[PDB]
Amino acid sequence: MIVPVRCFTCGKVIGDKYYEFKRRVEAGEDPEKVLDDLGLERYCCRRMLLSHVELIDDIMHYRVY
């Protein structure tokens, strides 16, 4: 649905740095350099951002009251 707050394996907080990564990778930058700049060294954390889908935005159209 929405970006997880913490990496599952090691608990590092990565929930606040998804939008910056998406924007800088849509701006034509090298994804590896962007991930290195953001400070994610262990690949257990890179796996979280590299493979996420924002499915929240296309389910708010249906309201249940």
Binding site: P4, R6, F8, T9, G11, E32, L35, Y43, L50, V64
Partner: protein, 283 residues
């Protein structure tokens, strides 16, 4: 984790891994009978026949419908309905309310009121239940390897690689040679390489990236081409004698949960014809 059993980390579960929710819908109708006889939505009086305990009619509004977002246990009543009296009992309405299944639990999610195609009223109620992984739940990859959770381990007891990685899952090496699923190892290497490189890996059948290219890329990135690493024992605190294969593998959670299979009977209803116990978990 012997005989196709798997071991899962606890802290990973506590952080939202493989969490899911279960839904179920109940239906009630205010039917019309031959003549002036009809059903009614109403909180039953203590006088009527078959009147359950007053504890069950706990969170029913005076119109006969349950308030949304209220906790419900087994045998709790969702919609209160009183049928016309059954001819032999005169002047005694029959209680035929709709109740939650005797072995379920959840929270009411939504209530809908509408009218059927011939004028009768109709209500539909849904129940939401949260389910966390436990013992007996079935996990399975896409290469044909299936199993159930055998044990849940605290984080500090799991081994860790010398580069700072803690496994999220443990699989027995005895299950690999007999099934001959080399694609799982290929996928593990490719997934680790893809996660390191920041770009997804193509594996489309006969056109995907060859194995040797992935191994060479993994060697370039700093790790070992065999895919092995050095780990330290989580209890004793010293490294094991052998390098351990480790990677990233896609996994799926099937819908054969243990919470829908447990069943036990001591005494209950019996068949009318043969006076033997009934058939089915549902009854």
């Amino acid at each position: 984790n012997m005989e196709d059993a798997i071991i899962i980390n606890k802290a990973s579960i506590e952080r939202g891994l493989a969490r899911s929710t279960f839904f179920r819908t109940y239906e009630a109708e205010e039917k019309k009978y031959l003549g002036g006889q009809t059903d009614k939505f109403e909180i039953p009086d203590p006088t009527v026949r078959g009147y359950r305990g007053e504890k069950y009619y706990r969170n029913l509004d005076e119109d006969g419908l349950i308030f949304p977002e209220s906790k419900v246990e087994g045998k709790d009543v969702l919609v209160g309905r009183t049928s016309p009296p059954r001819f032999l009992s005169l002047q005694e309405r029959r209680e035929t309310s709709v109740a939650v299944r005797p072995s379920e639990k959840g929270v009411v999610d939504k209530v809908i009121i509408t009218e059927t195609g011939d004028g009768t009223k109709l209500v539909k109620v849904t129940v939401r239940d949260l389910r966390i992984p436990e013992l007996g739940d079935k996990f399975a990859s896409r290469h044909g390897q299936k199993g159930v959770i055998g044990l849940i381990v605290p984080q500090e007891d799991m081994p860790w690689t010398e580069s700072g990685i803690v496994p999220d899952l443990i699989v027995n090496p005895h299950g690999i040679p007999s099934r001959m699923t080399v694609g799982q190892l290929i996928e593990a290497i490719g997934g680790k390489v893809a996660s390191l490189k920041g770009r997804r890996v193509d594996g489309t059948a006969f056109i995907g990236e060859p194995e040797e290219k992935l191994r060479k890329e993994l060697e370039e990135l700093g790790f070992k081409h065999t895919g092995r690493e050095i780990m330290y024992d989580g209890i004793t605190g010293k490294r094991l004698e052998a390098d351990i294969f480790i990677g990233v593998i896609y996994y799926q959670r099937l819908h054969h949960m243990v919470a829908d299979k447990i069943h036990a009977r001591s005494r209950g209803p019996v068949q009318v014809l043969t006076k033997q116990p009934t058939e089915g978990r549902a009854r």
